[PDB]
Design a binder for this molecule. Structure first.
Ligand code: GTP
Ligand code: V6A
Ligand code: MG
Lengths: 1031, 170, 84, 236, 106
């Protein structure tokens, strides 16, 4: 095992054994189990100890394997990051010379590169840190030396270009969060001044040098630099011309040249139009040279290798970006019209590529073009831009219809300790893709609705006669047809959908076999669901569709029933009104007929389909406006499940032990699920059904609670794996879901509070408190949370009872550690936020000890790791502070008792790395606190210093706290930081960046103005900020 | 026989350990046990062209419990840079992890996975994940517990690595 | 009953309501004479009268009425004249 | 998997098809889907149909199911295509493997123009396909579903006039789907129960007698009065 | 069930409906109903074959299946012309004209 040899690596009292260190480092990457565990542990401990110099200066020399030298470089980078400005200048110069010597020795050994590529890269990174901390003043000649060494030889020039790339990255793209704002500004200014010296070396190596590795490295460097290069160098030189001519038309340079051209095109300046025009023209010429207009781009991509695919994608990116940015310019340039059309054809061909990313990239520009054209004029198909683009739109529409992401997204998920359901996704990547395609297609239809009609008709007919028959094609065409909905005037929609339905029914009759029949059934069922506007004008057709759906729900073939139920509910939602009225030529509203047949329609559907169908019916009932008719409707509507409910209730009354019968529990769960869906759909009037079962519902909930608690006691947590336990927990969750849902839908808060609320407090809260912690139901808290959210103040009186019931027992679950019972934490803090935001006076009334415990809970909240919990805690705290501003009577006492502790806790959290996510909330809270302080509040936070204005005592207190936390900070640092807090009080973004800046400094053993403080610069920034917040 | 290694990167609170735990044993985990250092998890897959195995390395995404930082990446042939769609900041840190990765890798196959799309509060709006494009990265919307797209990252990595565009799991 | 006389002089006897089907007969309404309807068509129209009045408002399917193609033209002419 | 002439018909460009017909020996040539190019010409446009018919294109070209181009021309309601194909000598009563005559397919859509033309060329109305449906049966099934408008009403009027008489009460009762539309089931039942005026029966007998020729020109040679021949052309 | 009979004699023509069980005597009263000729003075024939007045319609050469209201059955009738059974003579209907050219078969 060799742990006895291993633990010596931390023995810093003796010289390092380079051989053993290298062996352990290599075994890390070639070890397992305890070997890897303790290896990484020892290495991490080793990297932390102070004597890093003795270890580095030895590893980099006597290390055999490369990764060991890499680890030594990592240690030295830690040293350079932490203790740089406090090293003796002797060691500073020694380190600088040692690293530059190592770099020169390693880089020039071969002509361009060696197996040290990672090792030389990390050497470059070390030198880049040194440069970050020493460049603008201690090495005012480094840039000139780099340029000279570059001109001297290529084995130095390539590595110098790598160095420059790394430095430009670190200085212009990765500064925030790792370098102070003022230091970053200084470095960027220095680079702006020193670029040209680099630029001429770049131009030399680009136009005269011919070492392909070197030129590729230079192109990468230019790409990176382009993110910030002053535009004078870019557009006012020959750089674009050189790129296009000498590097876009050779396999190993075209990728990088195209990336650079893309970055150049993305610029949005207005006075560089001619440079853009020339760029586009030359680029198109070159593209025609390498990529002819008639190439089979799709086959090329499928068969092509990484380079070809990357070139295709980057061609797409360049075209899309340049067009989105300046296409109007070329469109105005008459002579280039042919090139414009050729570029459009390029993007057409690329669009055929089967890669999703490339298709999305092209679709982005397509959507932009369509939206721009629609804005140009809202009327359908003369507008100038539209007049120009018209010829392409035909192919655009053809592609849009041939390819169309499926709108649906259905998944099978198992939850509740083993219960499987079906779920739908809202805005995953695929759904967004479909949304973009649909939006573009709708715009295009608004342009040429007639052409869309013709294309869709032709594709459908092609499916009919078997010429293009294929399930994939049929589904895609149906999704495309559904994509447009109301896109055309309802008369044209009438004609188009009539034709489509006739053709689809004809195809259904023509084909045969269960598979084809099922596919076509799903297809038409989808199409109809997406056209409620047509259905609401054709009562006969709507009735026929509903009847056919009823017929389908008896089908046993998989897929038919689920789609049938989904279509039925979709139709009910958008057509609820017509089912509850007598249509022309009808005797009774169609709802009445449906209700009478509920018995047999669902005779074959599985429980989930049953719930969905009941939800659809409920949606249908809600449209009813007559209260008495609605009540009769609801009575008959819930008649059926109520019978089983009452039977089970009577059986339980005869003997409650039936509740341990799994079948009865499952039936109860199904009944409650049905009721939940009905409550969701019907809305407030559903109370009539609720009252009929409220009391026995709560009673059975209590009985199941008792049963589950006893089972857990006798068997422990493991018994939750028992399906019976799963079933009771189901029943409970669904009961709570019903109650919370109805309360959400209810709109008579006083009636709810005085009728339905107290029974919960009786039979749920004390239950929760009594239950063993493991079996306590987290959803319990959410119900009261929603009840409070809806009732507002009307529930205030019972807040103390609710809290005495649940609050004390909840915290003991979530105070021992940060991890366990997360759902409990989320629900509890949601409840607390609701109470604070709506029932604040309750907090004033409860004993001060309870309020103290609440504040402790809030602090524990925003001290958590999970970002949601922390954000909830911070929001609760901010709302609490806001509210207390009105309770002036107790406001002063609350300040005196908690303000200093809260401020301490906020600074504690901010000064920690694991909570940068809530930086904005921290800034807001601190700004509010300091506004309270400075603007003036009556009391004084410290009795001995009663005459001492808080504006001074708090400054001193916070300075002392920061010093205690971080001794190595210079007094000037802390004093400036605290003064800025007041100065940056009203400029919340400035306050946030100031907090981040301070967070940067604490990580380093900063020096005594040793290139870190820039005190005079900060003074000017803060003093005007103090003036800024002043006015 | 074929063998590789895999390193996971991405700031904490984005499901780095849950993916590997699920693929190893299949059942979800809720507790946010912060990862320490790196854990070696031997992993296996079966395909139409046989079995391929990943030695998965789980790098903690917390600055306070990370360990060796980039040194873990030295021998890796593939990695997933993951974040969370619900936590916007986790996305803003993706470029930082990408940089820290490439500098020690030769543009190896890397997949960007946006976790926790099952949550209905999609703070990280789609239509604003354009970064993965310009770095030739393969992007997947994923979820550890709902299993949405739960196999696409591994499948795509296997296709690009073993070198067989017809590869498929079974 | 009513007696129908054809153009060729043939005489046909049919009860009133049966023969009453023709609108020309209703306008006429105990004898009717036709200058243009030959016997072979008068018998055909009488058979049609009995056929219709037998199957009028018939729940069961009505068997087809056989017609000789040779007589078809004058049969149609007679039907129009009688507007049966 | 298709000849260039078939693709030209796909685009249905008269110039392309007519210039490719210089090779027109392939005009009656099958392809991957067994669709003779005349089928596509009928599906798309009348000009292609005409030009193909000029160069000896077979009007009754079969396919994988024998659905002659006339069937497709009717199904698409390409009135001019249908009339041209028939005038050139297409089998008005061409039978597919299901015996679905072109009139049956025209009714399937309730398209008035093609049905009118097919009747005008003496199409058979009393045909019954293998599944047992009939033109009027399918047109009614369309009306049950509530689709269509006054156009389908006129199409049903023309079919009712043509068929002379018809019955729908299979086994003495209406089909289930029709039953759910009492305000239409009553109309259908009263139509079924009414024996039909003798004039209509005589009209049908005459129309059968004439046969397959173009009737309205054919009737011109008849001695029947102008109004009554118009009636024979289903003007009432 | 019932059957429809076509009664003819010379140019005369009479239509009626008779049940199968109906006796030919019943048809004799039916003739009497419009004709002053008594029943004994009437004798009926099926294609010249004398019909027994006592015979029932069902057992004779007439039945509903054989004759329909659209397709009746001809019945020959004779009087006692000069106190003697006149030889049966049914005057045929005028021969139909000749089919025009258009309507000849294909
Ligand atoms: N909504 C949702 N949450 C998930 C999913 N997977 C994991 N989580 C949550 O995210 C946390 C993931 O923790 P880890 O596995 O350690 O991954 P991490 O968040 O990146 O933490 P580190 O590995 O230490 O960096 C879990 O505690 C879960 O609560 C998921 O698929 N959907
Ligand atoms: C044609 C015949 C059919 O019913 N096919 N489906 C199956 C599948 N499995 C067993 C038995 N039959 N056909 C297919 N679809 C339709 C049709 C569906 C619908 C919809 F509402 F369900 F989408 C409506 C209609 C309508 F509107 F009534 F015409 C028809 N018919
Ligand atoms: Mg983890």
């Amino acid at each position: 095992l060799a742990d006895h040899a291993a633990r010596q690596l931390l023995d810093f009292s003796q010289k390092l054994d380079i051989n053993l260190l290298d062996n352990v480092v290599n075994c890390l990457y070639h070890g397992e189990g305890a070997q890897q565990r303790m290896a990484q542990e020892v290495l991490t401990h080793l990297k932390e100890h102070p004597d890093a110099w003795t270890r580095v200066d030895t590893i980099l020399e006597f290390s055999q394997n490369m990764n060991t030298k890499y680890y030594g470089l990592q240690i030295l980078e830690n040293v350079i990051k932490t203790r740089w400005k406090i090293l003796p200048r002797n060691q500073c110069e020694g380190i600088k010379k040692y690293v530059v010597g190592l770099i020169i020795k390693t880089s020039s050994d071969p002509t361009c590169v060696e197996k040290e590529k990672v090792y030389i890269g990390k050497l470059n990174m070390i030198l880049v840190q040194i440069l970050k901390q020493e460049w603008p003043k201690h090495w005012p000649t480094f840039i000139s030396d780099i340029v000279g060494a570059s001109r001297t030889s290529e084995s130095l020039c390539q590595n110098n270009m790598v160095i420059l790339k790394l430095l430009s990255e670190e200085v212009f793209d990765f500064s925030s969060g790792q370098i102070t704002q003022v230091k970053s500004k200084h470095l960027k200014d220095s680079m702006c001044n020193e670029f040209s010296q680099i630029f001429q070396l770049c131009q030399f190596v680009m136009e005269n040098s011919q070492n392909a590795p070197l030129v590729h490295a230079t192109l990468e460097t230019l790409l990176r630099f382009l993110n910030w290069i002053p535009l004078g160098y870019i557009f006012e030189t020959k750089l674009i011309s050189t790129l296009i001519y000498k590097f876009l038309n050779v396999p190993m340079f075209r990728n990088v040249s195209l990336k650079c051209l893309t970055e150049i095109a993305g610029v949005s300046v207005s006075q560089y139009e001619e440079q853009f025009v020339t760029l586009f023209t030359l680029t198109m010429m070159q593209l025609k040279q390498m990529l002819p207009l008639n190439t089979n781009i799709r086959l090329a991509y499928s068969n092509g290798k990484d380079d070809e695919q990357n070139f295709i994608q980057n061609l797409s990116l360049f075209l899309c970006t340049f067009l989105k940015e300046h296409d109007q310019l070329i469109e105005k340039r008459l002579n280039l019209r042919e090139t414009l059309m050729e570029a459009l054809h390029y993007m057409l061909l690329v669009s055929e590529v089967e890669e999703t990313e490339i298709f999305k990239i092209c679709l982005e520009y397509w959507n932009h073009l369509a939206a721009e054209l629609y804005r140009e004029s809202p009327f359908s198909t003369v507008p100038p831009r539209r007049q120009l683009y018209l010829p392409m739109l035909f192919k655009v529409r053809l592609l849009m219809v041939s390819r169309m992401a499926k709108p649906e997204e259905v998944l099978v998920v198992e939850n509740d300790q083993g219960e499987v359901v079906r779920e739908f996704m809202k805005d995953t990547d695929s759904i967004n893709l479909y949304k973009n395609m649909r939006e573009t297609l709708v715009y295009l239809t608004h342009l040429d609705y007639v052409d869309t009609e013709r294309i869709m008709t032709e594709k459908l007919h092609n499916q009919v006669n078997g010429t293009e028959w294929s399930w994939k094609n049929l589904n895609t065409l149906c999704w495309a047809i559904g994509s447009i909905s109301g896109a055309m005037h309802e008369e044209d929609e009438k004609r188009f959908l009539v034709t489509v339905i006739k053709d689809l029914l004809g195809l259904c009759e023509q084909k045969r076999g269960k598979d084809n029949k099922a596919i076509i059934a799903s297809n038409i069922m989808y199409i109809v669901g997406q056209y409620p506007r047509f259905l609401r004008a054709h009562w006969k057709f709507l009735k026929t569709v509903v009847n056919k759906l009823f017929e389908f729900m008896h089908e046993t073939h998989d897929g038919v029933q689920d789609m049938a139920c989904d279509t039925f509910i979709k139709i009910a939602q958008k057509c609820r009104r017509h089912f509850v009225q007598v249509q022309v030529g009808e005797v009774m509203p169609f709802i009445d007929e449906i209700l009478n047949n509920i018995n047999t329609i669902i005779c074959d559907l599985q429980p989930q389909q049953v719930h969905t169908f009941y939800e659809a019916v409920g949606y249908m009932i809600g449209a009813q406006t007559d209260q008495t008719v609605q009540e009769h409707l609801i009575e008959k509507y819930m008649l059926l499940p109520n019978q089983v409910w009452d039977s089970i209730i009577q059986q339980a009354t005869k003997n409650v032990d039936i509740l341990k019968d799994p079948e009865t529990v499952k039936q109860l769960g199904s009944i409650l699920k049905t009721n939940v869906r009905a409550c969701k759909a019907v809305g407030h009037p559903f109370v009539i059904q609720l009252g009929r079962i409220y009391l026995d519902m709560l009673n059975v909930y209590k009985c199941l609670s008792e049963n589950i608690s006893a089972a857990i006691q006798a068997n422990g947590e493991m018994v939750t794996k028992q399906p019976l336990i799963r079933s009771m927990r189901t029943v409970k969750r669904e009961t709570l879901k019903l109650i919370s849902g109805w309360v959400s839908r209810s709109n008579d808060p006083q009636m709810v509070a005085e009728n339905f609320v107290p029974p919960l407090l009786d039979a749920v809260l004390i239950d929760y408190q009594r239950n063993v912690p493991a079996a306590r139901e987290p959803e319990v808290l959410s119900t009261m949370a929603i009840i409070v959210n809806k009732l507002g103040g009307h529930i205030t009186a019972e807040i103390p009872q609710i809290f005495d019931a649940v609050f004390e027992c909840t915290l003991n679950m979530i105070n021992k550690d940060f991890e366990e019972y997360p759902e409990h934490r989320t629900n509890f803090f949601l409840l607390l936020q609701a109470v604070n935001s709506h029932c604040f006076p309750a907090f004033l009334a409860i004993p001060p000890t309870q309020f103290k415990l609440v504040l402790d809970s809030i602090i524990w909240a925003f001290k958590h790791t999970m970002r949601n919990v922390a954000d909830t805690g911070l929001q609760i705290l901010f709302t609490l502070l806001q509210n207390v501003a009105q309770e002036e009577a107790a406001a002063q006492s609350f300040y005196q008792t908690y303000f200093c502790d809260i401020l301490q806790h906020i600074f504690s959290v901010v000064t920690d790395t694991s909570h940068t996510a809530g930086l904005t909330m921290h800034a807001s809270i601190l700004a509010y606190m300091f506004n309270l302080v400075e603007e003036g509040k009556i009391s004084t936070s410290l009795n001995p210093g009663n005459p001492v204005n808080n504006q001074i005592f708090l400054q001193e207190y916070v300075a002392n706290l920061l010093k205690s936390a971080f001794p190595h900070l210079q007094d000037a640092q802390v004093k400036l930081f605290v003064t800025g807090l007041f100065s940056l009080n009203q400029d919340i973004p400035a306050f946030k960046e100031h907090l981040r800046d301070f967070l940067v400094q604490i990580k380093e053993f900063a020096g005594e103005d040793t290139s870190d403080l820039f005190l005079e610069e900060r003074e000017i920034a803060l003093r005007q900020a103090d003036e800024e917040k002043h006015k | 026989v074929p063998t590789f290694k895999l390193v996971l990167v991405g700031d904490g609170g984005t499901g780095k350990t849950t993916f590997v735990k699920r693929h190893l044993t299949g059942e979800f985990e809720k507790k946010y046990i912060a990862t320490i250092g790196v854990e070696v998890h031997p992993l296996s897959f079966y395909t139409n062209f046989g079995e391929i195995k990943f030695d998965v390395w789980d790098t903690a995404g917390l600055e306070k419990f990370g360990g060796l930082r980039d040194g873990y990446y030295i021998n890796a042939q593939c990695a997933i840079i993951m974040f969370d769609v619900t936590s916007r900041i986790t996305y803003k840190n993706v470029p930082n992890w990408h940089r820290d990765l490439v500098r020690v890798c030769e543009n190896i196959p890397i997949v960007l996975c946006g976790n926790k799309v099952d949550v209905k509060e999609r703070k990280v709006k789609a239509k604003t994940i354009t970064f993965h494009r310009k770095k030739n990265l393969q992007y997947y919307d994923i979820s550890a517990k709902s299993n949405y797209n739960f196999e696409k990252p591994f499948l795509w990595l296997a296709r690009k690595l073993a070198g067989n565009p017809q590869l498929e799991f079974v | 009953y009513v007696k129908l006389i054809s153009s060729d002089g043939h005489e046909f006897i049919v009860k009133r309501e049966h023969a009453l089907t023709s609108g020309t007969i209703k306008a006429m309404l105990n004898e009717v004479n036709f200058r243009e309807i030959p016997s072979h068509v008068l018998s055909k129209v009488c058979m049609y009268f009995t056929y219709k009045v037998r199957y009028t408002n018939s729940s069961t399917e009505i068997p087809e009425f056989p017609i000789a193609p040779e007589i078809a033209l004058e049969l149609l002419m007679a039907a129009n004249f009688l507007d049966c | 998997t298709l000849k260039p002439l078939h693709c030209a018909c796909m685009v249905s460009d008269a110039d392309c098809v007519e210039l490719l017909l210089e090779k027109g020996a392939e005009v009656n040539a099958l392809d991957g889907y067994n669709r003779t190019a005349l089928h596509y010409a009928a599906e798309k446009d009348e000009a292609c149909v005409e030009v193909l018919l000029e160069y000896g294109a077979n009007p009754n070209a079969l396919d994988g199911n024998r659905d002659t181009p006339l069937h497709w021309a009717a199904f698409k309601n390409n009135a001019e295509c249908v009339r041209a194909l028939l005038e050139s000598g297409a089998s008005v009563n061409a039978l597919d493997y299901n015996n679905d005559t072109p009139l049956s397919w025209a009714a399937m859509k309730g398209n008035l123009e093609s049905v009118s033309i097919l009747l005008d060329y003496g199409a058979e109305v009393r045909v019954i396909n293998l599944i047992g449906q009939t033109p009027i049966s399918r047109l009614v099934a369309l009306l049950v579903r509530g689709l269509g408008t006054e156009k389908e009403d006129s199409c049903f009027e023309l079919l009712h006039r043509a068929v002379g008489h018809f019955e729908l009460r299979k086994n003495g009762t209406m089909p289930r789907e029709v039953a759910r539309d009492p305000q239409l089931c009553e109309k259908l039942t009263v139509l079924c129960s009414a024996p039909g005026t003798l004039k209509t029966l005589a009209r049908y007998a005459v129309r059968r007698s004439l046969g397959l020729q173009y009737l309205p020109d054919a009737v011109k040679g008849l001695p029947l009065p102008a109004s009554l021949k118009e009636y024979l052309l289903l003007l009432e | 069930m019932d059957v429809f009979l076509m009664i003819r004699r010379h140019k005369t023509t009479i239509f009626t409906d008779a049940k199968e069980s109906s006796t030919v005597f019943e048809l004799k009263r039916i003739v009497e109903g419009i004709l002053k000729r008594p029943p004994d003075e009437q004798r009926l024939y099926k294609d010249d074959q004398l019909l027994d007045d006592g015979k029932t319609l069902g057992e004779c050469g007439f039945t509903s299946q054989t004759a329909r209201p659209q397709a009746p059955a001809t019945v020959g009738l004779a009087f006692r012309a000069d106190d003697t059974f006149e030889a049966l003579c049914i005057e045929p209907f005028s021969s139909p004209p000749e089919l025009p050219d258009v309507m000849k078969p294909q």
